Amino acid sequence: KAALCLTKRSRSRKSLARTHGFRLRMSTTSGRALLKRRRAKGRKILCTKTNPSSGKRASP
Amino acid sequence: QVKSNPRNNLISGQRRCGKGRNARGIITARHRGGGHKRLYRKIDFRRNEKDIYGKIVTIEYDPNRNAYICLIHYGDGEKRYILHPRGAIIGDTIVSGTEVPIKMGNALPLTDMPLGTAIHNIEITLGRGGQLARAAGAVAKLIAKEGKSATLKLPSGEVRLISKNCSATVGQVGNVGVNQKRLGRAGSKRWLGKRPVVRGVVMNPVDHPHGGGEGRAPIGRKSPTTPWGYPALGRRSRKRNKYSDNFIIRRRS
RNA sequence: CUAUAACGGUCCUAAGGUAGCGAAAUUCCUUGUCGGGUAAGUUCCGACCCGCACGAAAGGCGUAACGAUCUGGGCACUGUC
RNA sequence: AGUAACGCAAACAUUGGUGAGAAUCCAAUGCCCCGAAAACCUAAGGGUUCCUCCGCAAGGUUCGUCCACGGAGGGUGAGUCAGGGCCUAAGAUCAGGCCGAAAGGCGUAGUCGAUGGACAACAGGUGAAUAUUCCUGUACUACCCCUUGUUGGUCCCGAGGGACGGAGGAGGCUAGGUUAGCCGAAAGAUGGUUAUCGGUUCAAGGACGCAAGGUGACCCUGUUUUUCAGGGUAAGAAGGGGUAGAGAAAAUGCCUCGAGCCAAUGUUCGAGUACCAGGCGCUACGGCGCUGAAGUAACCGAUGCCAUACUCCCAGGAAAAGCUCGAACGACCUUCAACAAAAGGGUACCUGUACCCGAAACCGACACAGGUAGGUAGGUAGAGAAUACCUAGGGGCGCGAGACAACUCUCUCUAAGGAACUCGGCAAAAUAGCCCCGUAACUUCGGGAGAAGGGGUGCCCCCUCGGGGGUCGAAGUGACCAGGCCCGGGCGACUGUUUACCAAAAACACAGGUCUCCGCAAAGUCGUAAGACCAUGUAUGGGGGCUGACGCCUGCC
RNA sequence: GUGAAACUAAGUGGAGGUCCGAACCGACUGAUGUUGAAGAAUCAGCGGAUGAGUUGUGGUUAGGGGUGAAAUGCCACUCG
RNA sequence: AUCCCGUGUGAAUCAGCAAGGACCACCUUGCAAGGCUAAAUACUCCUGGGUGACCGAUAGCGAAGUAGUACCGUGAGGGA
Numbered sequence A: 001k002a003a004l005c006l007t008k009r010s011r012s013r014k015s016l017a018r019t020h021g022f023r024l025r026m027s028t029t030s031g032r033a034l035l036k037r038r039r040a041k042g043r044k045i046l047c048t049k050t051n052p053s054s055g056k057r058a059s060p
Numbered sequence B: 001q002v003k004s005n006p007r008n009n010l011i012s013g014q015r016r017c018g019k020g021r022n023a024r025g026i027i028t029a030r031h032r033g034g035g036h037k038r039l040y041r042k043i044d045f046r047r048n049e050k051d052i053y054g055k056i057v058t059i060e061y062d063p064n065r066n067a068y069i070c071l072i073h074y075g076d077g078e079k080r081y082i083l084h085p086r087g088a089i090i091g092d093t094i095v096s097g098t099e100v101p102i103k104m105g106n107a108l109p110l111t112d113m114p115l116g117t118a119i120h121n122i123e124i125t126l127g128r129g130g131q132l133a134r135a136a137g138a139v140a141k142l143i144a145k146e147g148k149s150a151t152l153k154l155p156s157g158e159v160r161l162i163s164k165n166c167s168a169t170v171g172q173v174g175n176v177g178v179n180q181k182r183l184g185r186a187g188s189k190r191w192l193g194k195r196p197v198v199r200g201v202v203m204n205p206v207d208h209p210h211g212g213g214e215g216r217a218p219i220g221r222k223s224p225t226t227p228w229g230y231p232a233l234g235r236r237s238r239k240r241n242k243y244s245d246n247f248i249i250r251r252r253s
Numbered sequence C: 001c002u003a004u005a006a007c008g009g010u011c012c013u014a015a016g017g018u019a020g021c022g023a024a025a026u027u028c029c030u031u032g033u034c035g036g037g038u039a040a041g042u043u044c045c046g047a048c049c050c051g052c053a054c055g056a057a058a059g060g061c062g063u064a065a066c067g068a069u070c071u072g073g074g075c076a077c078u079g080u081c
Numbered sequence D: 001a002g003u004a005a006c007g008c009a010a011a012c013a014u015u016g017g018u019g020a021g022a023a024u025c026c027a028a029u030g031c032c033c034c035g036a037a038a039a040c041c042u043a044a045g046g047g048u049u050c051c052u053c054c055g056c057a058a059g060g061u062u063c064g065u066c067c068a069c070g071g072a073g074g075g076u077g078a079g080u081c082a083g084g085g086c087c088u089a090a091g092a093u094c095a096g097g098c099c100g101a102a103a104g105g106c107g108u109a110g111u112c113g114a115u116g117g118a119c120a121a122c123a124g125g126u127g128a129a130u131a132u133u134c135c136u137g138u139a140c141u142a143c144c145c146c147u148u149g150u151u152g153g154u155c156c157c158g159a160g161g162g163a164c165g166g167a168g169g170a171g172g173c174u175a176g177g178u179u180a181g182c183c184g185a186a187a188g189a190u191g192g193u194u195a196u197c198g199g200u201u202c203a204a205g206g207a208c209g210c211a212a213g214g215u216g217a218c219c220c221u222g223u224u225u226u227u228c229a230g231g232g233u234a235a236g237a238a239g240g241g242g243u244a245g246a247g248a249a250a251a252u253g254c255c256u257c258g259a260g261c262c263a264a265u266g267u268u269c270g271a272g273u274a275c276c277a278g279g280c281g282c283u284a285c286g287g288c289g290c291u292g293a294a295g296u297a298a299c300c301g302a303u304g305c306c307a308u309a310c311u312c313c314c315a316g317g318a319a320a321a322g323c324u325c326g327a328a329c330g331a332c333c334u335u336c337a338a339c340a341a342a343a344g345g346g347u348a349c350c351u352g353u354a355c356c357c358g359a360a361a362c363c364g365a366c367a368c369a370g371g372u373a374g375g376u377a378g379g380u381a382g383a384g385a386a387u388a389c390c391u392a393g394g395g396g397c398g399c400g401a402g403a404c405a406a407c408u409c410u411c412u413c414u415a416a417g418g419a420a421c422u423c424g425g426c427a428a429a430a431u432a433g434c435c436c437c438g439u440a441a442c443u444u445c446g447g448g449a450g451a452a453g454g455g456g457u458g459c460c461c462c463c464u465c466g467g468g469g470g471u472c473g474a475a476g477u478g479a480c481c482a483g484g485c486c487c488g489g490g491c492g493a494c495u496g497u498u499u500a501c502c503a504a505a506a507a508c509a510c511a512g513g514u515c516u517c518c519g520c521a522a523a524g525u526c527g528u529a530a531g532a533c534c535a536u537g538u539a540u541g542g543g544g545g546c547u548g549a550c551g552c553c554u555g556c557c
Numbered sequence E: 001g002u003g004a005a006a007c008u009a010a011g012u013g014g015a016g017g018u019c020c021g022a023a024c025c026g027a028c029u030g031a032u033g034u035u036g037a038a039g040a041a042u043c044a045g046c047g048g049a050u051g052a053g054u055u056g057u058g059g060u061u062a063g064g065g066g067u068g069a070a071a072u073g074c075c076a077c078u079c080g
Numbered sequence F: 001a002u003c004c005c006g007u008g009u010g011a012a013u014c015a016g017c018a019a020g021g022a023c024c025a026c027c028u029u030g031c032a033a034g035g036c037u038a039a040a041u042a043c044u045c046c047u048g049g050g051u052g053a054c055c056g057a058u059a060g061c062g063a064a065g066u067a068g069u070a071c072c073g074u075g076a077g078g079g080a
């Protein structure tokens, strides 16, 4: 019943950082290649979807 | 007949879950999925604990096989499920061992069974557990024995040699009328978690070797074909030289 | 008696389309011909068979119930006119 | 081109006020809209949008004194709420292990992983912005502390328990609601009238307790078996004890003792000098201080509670920890050390907590006619969470003012005719509830069927517990709501599925049929391999091909 | 009803991929919309609505692939 | 031919063995089946000096100011 463009819905931050998170990119070799080449471009933010385990941004 | 008990320690919840998905997570075995959650009953197929006297307390339904199953007690308080033999009634008594009466539900090595007997739940390998003829209404006759080897006629009609020291159980497997049911509606398939199958002829060429000819397709394939490109009809797949071959005598007809 | 062909001759094939259906979601010529329904019917229903080119699990022929199915007619109803 | 538009057809109006300036900002009085939301709350998300003061460049589809905008300064308080310090599911990682040019792949113990298991708090008050968090009352968990009582406790291990479906209806109850009773106020300029308007509230928790409820075997006699009455049988219920076998607990077998049990709810404490209609006084006229009457009963009645209680069905309905029980084996600790108890005093880990959340703050590039899990469920009419009109609470759609042309769109009606329209009755109109009579061909005997078609219906009295009499209207289920139907044919048996955003079908599925492969280290599929699925299955099962209910059949080569 | 059984009203019972119909899931016709209010909507009607149902949270399968009640459909407005 | 690897076979020790572009004879040259070694050569995320018929804000680095920023994208990434 929802429009095509609605692909990005309200999804728990917990779920997202379990996907694009830091600790995930660290696991695979391809991820470490990721972080090298982000660091090369010198991005202010390495992993965009990340998330505090507990704190002000914490998902329960 | 079917009256639910509380849970004996033989009924657990641990099991494979993705049905038809392998490690890679792919559907290997097509059409499964959906259907009622089940619990695994731990059957005793080996019947290995010898020389104690068991009593059939009840008869229970099992979702994992079309046969019935019987809860039996012992004088030792151990409880086991066995496949329900045909005609066995509650209050009955069974026993396994070597020198034993021959009646329904007793299990013994093939050295001691009088030729002509109707047998089920047949080990092919010493102490591996019973393997052959476990389904509803399945039975195999012990036709002849010679040397170290016994000869059976399996429910497929195939005649085959096995070891004379492999245990088996007297009597046919119960619930004979099961294939007399008529499911009657689609939903009643789905309840068993058997999902709908598409005919080859329907799908597009990419998807299957009988691919869409314009209106309706005769199968132009010079031969009926597996999804994967093999002849569908009458091509024997039995591994040419399997170790088994020396044992097998006449082939199912 | 005009006609038609149960019956014969021959030809060629592995064998020559049986039951049932048939101008059909299949019929080219073709708005075939007949009957019905209409004051008037290239659609519709029934039947003929001359099946260009139906036909038996790429199922054949029936069929109660069912369908935001396709298609013809009728009562009620209306600014559809 | 100073043109189209200014984002619904819920609707605004006036009087004051502030101000340089007011259709738009504040207040008052009307009027209007939502009310299974356009109300209140919570998950996710957002991230400071919350509050106060200041501002009006930009933003705001106009305006602007205003703001979710800009500037400063503030604001989120927990043993009990939610997660973590507890446990595991799907899944993930995986020591060693197996495999692999490398990276890595598979996989065992382990360890992660809630959307589930376990586990303790409520009422009132304060309140620019927080409250089961702060205050005052009563509570409750977990430790520690002392007295007393025992001597072994602790983990590892053995066990019981935790622990589970769908559908159905009948109870027994509350929550709510309505009407009385009690209490207080009432005159609302009209013909009459007090028939009017307000109040009648209280939680967690602790003690008690359970029938007209539900369960507690059989046999004889009756009440319809039932609710019951008399007798009898000897475990015959929750619930306990003993014994036996390699046998502690458990499971299992034999023996014994028990007629009660179960749990919502109820009575009482908590709980009154709480809360509250009014009353008195102040008004910075915003709000404030002061004293407070009655606080019960009946009838409706849940989709909530007992309740995993029943009965039935087949498709047969999570794990682990806390918890209860316990010998041998192993490890460790041991005396004022440890454990066991009823009181008493003490003691109290992190993180979330603002605000929005049927949204102008999330998701749609917008202050966008859209999307977004859950909770709470008032009145009158009604079968109802439909509809209409309302309460509580919230709103009047961030451009207006006129005028009343053509034309377009959303709508109401139309004389006579009644499908003549058109590709086609497309769209409109018609029908409609309830009770009563009646109801065909055909059939797989289930249906068809609400077939078709007809009658009745308001409001008063009277009778029986439907009937008669009266009486208005042109019209009585008078609005909203609420089937057009019949006769044919094709196709497909049927409910289903499908081309997100031009195709919903005759296509796909299907129950059924039939062929063929497959004897378990199965065939088949995926992997370089290891191995995984198949299957913790075993030919009444597993692959694959075609056909497609049921009926009649399925011919030759 | 007969000795067994069949056959038939009755009551009870509450089956169904039953029926009508809100929520909810869809998307059949029409009108509007077409520099939209909206990159698929609104309005009036329409289908399913105890099931082959709907949905939340957390997961799985990945491009010589996956998934598909099969449309070359879908795999972040991209899919021979 | 020389060189180096899968599968299978499988020698000779200096009176030998290998190479001299199939192969054989002769002559010449060399000593496989154990290792290790600097320099001359390649390069610029850079450091220190220097030069420039190099740029001068649409150029020169994407970047003379928050520059891998704002913003966009679930993400890899894009990017003023």
Ligand SMILES: [Mg+2]
Pocket: A048
């Ligand atoms: Mg971003």
Ligand SMILES: [Mg+2]
Pocket: B007, B011, B012, D163
């Ligand atoms: Mg269980």
Ligand SMILES: [Mg+2]
Pocket: B007
């Ligand atoms: Mg248990």
Ligand SMILES: [Mg+2]
Pocket: B023, B024, B025
């Ligand atoms: Mg994986």
Ligand SMILES: [Mg+2]
Pocket: B197, B198, B199
């Ligand atoms: Mg199929």
Ligand SMILES: [Mg+2]
Pocket: B202, B203, B204, B212
């Ligand atoms: Mg196709």
Ligand SMILES: [Mg+2]
Pocket: B206
């Ligand atoms: Mg594909």
Ligand SMILES: [Mg+2]
Pocket: none
């Ligand atoms: Mg595939």
Ligand SMILES: [Mg+2]
Pocket: B205, B209
């Ligand atoms: Mg091909």
Ligand SMILES: [Mg+2]
Pocket: B210, B211, B212, B213, B217, B218, B219, B220
């Ligand atoms: Mg083909």
Ligand SMILES: [Mg+2]
Pocket: B214, B215, B216
């Ligand atoms: Mg064709």
Ligand SMILES: [Mg+2]
Pocket: none
């Ligand atoms: Mg004709």
Ligand SMILES: [Mg+2]
Pocket: C030
């Ligand atoms: Mg023609």
Ligand SMILES: [Mg+2]
Pocket: none
């Ligand atoms: Mg004619």
Ligand SMILES: [Mg+2]
Pocket: C043
């Ligand atoms: Mg016509």
Ligand SMILES: [Mg+2]
Pocket: none
């Ligand atoms: Mg005809």
